[PDB]
Amino acid sequence: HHSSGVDLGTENLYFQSNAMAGDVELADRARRRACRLLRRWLAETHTPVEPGPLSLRIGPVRVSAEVAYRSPTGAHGFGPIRVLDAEGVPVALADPVLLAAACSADSRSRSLPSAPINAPDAGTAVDWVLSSLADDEDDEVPAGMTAEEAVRLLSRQVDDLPRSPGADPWSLVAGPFAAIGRFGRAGIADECWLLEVLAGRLRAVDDDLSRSWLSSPTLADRAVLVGEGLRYRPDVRPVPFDVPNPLHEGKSDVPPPPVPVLGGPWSLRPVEVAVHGDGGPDVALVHRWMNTPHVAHHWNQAWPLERWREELAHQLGGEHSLPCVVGHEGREVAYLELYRVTRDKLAGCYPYGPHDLGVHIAIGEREVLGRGFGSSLLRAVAGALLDADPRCARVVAEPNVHNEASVRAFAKAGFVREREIGLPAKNSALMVFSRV
Amino acid sequence: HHSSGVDLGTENLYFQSNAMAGDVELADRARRRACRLLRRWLAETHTPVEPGPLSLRIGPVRVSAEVAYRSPTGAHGFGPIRVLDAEGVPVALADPVLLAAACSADSRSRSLPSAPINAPDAGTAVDWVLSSLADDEDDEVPAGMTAEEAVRLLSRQVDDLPDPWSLVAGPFAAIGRFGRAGIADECWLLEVLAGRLRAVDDDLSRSWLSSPTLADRAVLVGEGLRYRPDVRPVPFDVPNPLHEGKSDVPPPPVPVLGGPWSLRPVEVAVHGDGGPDVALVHRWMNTPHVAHHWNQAWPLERWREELAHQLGGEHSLPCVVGHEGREVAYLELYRVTRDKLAGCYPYGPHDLGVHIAIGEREVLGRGFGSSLLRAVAGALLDADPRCARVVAEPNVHNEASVRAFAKAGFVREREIGLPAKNSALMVFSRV
């Protein structure tokens, strides 16, 4: 009767409808995976998240979703994750493997070509995700759970952290904190309150690990999408990285960046923003420098003049960043930002000491310079900062691993490349100039 | 007022609803994409399709979908495409990028490490799919279209043709979309198309009406595929729906080998354990070098049932080859017009193929194989004077067998995509 299809009876419709029943749950399962990946991408890239629209370039795709619930531990709750074309039209929903592809494309690109993540036998997060679709579905948190019972689970879990000398430091983030986020995202309890409770369970035992977890400004977590050392042989061989420690004070009495005094051919002074008019010649110099191509290619801050005026005034009015004009034998040639790490984005990336100072650098008169200037200046600045503040342990910097002139200039000046770090727009070599 | 969320007013909900309105359309577009990809995969691997359930291995995932509409041109209509775990439970919906990833893995593996598809710089179908998400999507066939307008548009399109894959990619594509839309029966539209080809007597039209295969362009399967962001497709042969062969082709003949060689059909005894021949093949088929390639290291009863099945039909003829009195190999001699190979190259009706396993290479693996292949081919060409070719389809990865065939006078003509493997189409031609 039918040649291009099957002849239909009610029994056939019954069979197919009991199959299409479960598709709804299959839909939710993909949503949860994609939500997990995005949480990781944001965590491993130290991308700031706040409620409302989140908009994000990840590899080759514009990505956008509503942050319905912002989580203190990073367990954000998302609206539909959508893919956008160049002008904001949604073109797709971000399925788990679509994200795994965008992130793998983005990550492999963030790291250097010679990195392990880019070895031919290395595999990709796509392989990892594809391989795990049949894996066991973790129980989501029962919506009716009581905060009382939530604390009971957390206290029990906290007390089961390895009383062991060689024990995993990511245990705290991967065990208890993960639970806290699932509790908050489920609407079961406020995560700050749960964290406060966990601090209490940690204070009760003065174990070495317990006390450091209360005192360190960062904690160990494990990355699965961002990091030069990643492999996905079949599954992921994750790599450790530092995330902010929520159990640790949010401001301190650390004074602003000092104004160092440099040796040799170098002069240094803070920028001055005139309150009258368009800002003055210092604002003009930075604006001009920051819009030249060789600078803008790395800083990506080729803004209009008034935007730079407010930035410099903004920095100068605070305790974070100190913008400076550097001169070489009387000619003004470079711009610096010297900043307190404890108030910078870098503070969530490595175990900083309270007085750490960092530097951003741009040589603006590159129309003539690239002749040993940067490394000599960088060296002077580091020793000069260590002289200005004897409670500072390190001067640090975050050049893009691809910014090969900056990285080499930093190391010629005596910085040591400790590790790669994932930042929102780039992966950076954490260069460290250490005291004595 | 809320610390971890946004304070909601009705205006915020309005903004979010015109977004979720379009989400439904975002779902269908993924569905249309995934169905387009699966159509290509099935075509380019020559995987057989009939209505009802289709179940299929693609790279690292079991894949399963209902075939609601079986298309003469391959534009099949699917239910939900689902991914299944090892014991049949669905675990995911086969989203478009998921498919391109599984197919990329499967294809890169099917082709040789030296193939362009496997170069470090080649890019992957994943790159191609992601890069095209932002494309403006081609319009669907107007659901209210009349069959007349279907014919009018098709005739106009046929008449504006000159490349050989122009037919499958132009007219057949429309027939597939017309059919899948329910506008007209594809068999009727294909018949109309045939007439418009008779109307012009040029070599091009005549070949299209007479050849058992047509040229199509592949985008997932092929040693030569490149994805410089965009895909650089490669040609392959698909079955020709406009062709049905007069056929009347007899079963495979029994060749007579010269020199040190003897050949005879297998015998399967009734009621016992199949006799001694069923045992010898089963013994051979389970030794490591044989099972490593044939993947037919079965128990004894499946081979009894297997060989009996072949001998009773017009497809395959199982034979035992002896060399100077020692039985040393197993052959399957088969008619191409009845084999999986018939959708893969422009076959002649009497073409014959051969599968071979040398079981006593563990005692007689010393240069014999190519020489036996040479004898068998010429003896088959003697047995069927209407046969044009002897062919074989070893896995492109089985380079020892390929080399043995070419030493015996077969030519490695092309790579072809078969349901489980890519094969070197080795051809011994009477020319």
Ligand SMILES: CC(=O)SCCNC(=O)CCNC(=O)[C@H](O)C(C)(C)COP(=O)(O)OP(=O)(O)OC[C@H]1O[C@@H](n2cnc3c(N)ncnc32)[C@H](O)[C@@H]1OP(=O)(O)O
């Ligand atoms: C917010 C932010 O953007 S974070 C701030 C970090 N960003 C930056 O530092 C980018 C600033 N852009 C610039 O152009 C910077 O002024 C610089 C530091 C990168 C210029 O410094 P330079 O004048 O080039 O210093 P210098 O001449 O000493 O260069 C040192 C090394 O760079 C290497 N180098 C120079 N150019 C290149 C290049 N194109 N590729 C690779 N290495 C290079 C030089 O060979 C030298 O190494 P060497 O010891 O073997 O000779």
Ligand SMILES: CC(=O)SCCNC(=O)CCNC(=O)[C@H](O)C(C)(C)COP(=O)(O)OP(=O)(O)OC[C@H]1O[C@@H](n2cnc3c(N)ncnc32)[C@H](O)[C@@H]1OP(=O)(O)O
């Ligand atoms: C579904 C299916 O079953 S697909 C059917 C196709 N069959 C298969 O895929 C599996 C085949 N399995 C077998 O065991 C096959 O019989 C073989 C061909 C692989 C056995 O044959 P062989 O014993 O290797 O024959 P032979 O040694 O002559 O091989 C000839 C090739 O090897 C070389 N060779 C190797 N040893 C010798 C030798 N001792 N003397 C001369 N030539 C030799 C020949 O020069 C020739 O070409 P090459 O130099 O380019 O490699």
Ligand SMILES: [Mg+2]
């Ligand atoms: Mg019916």
Ligand SMILES: [Mg+2]
């Ligand atoms: Mg409200």
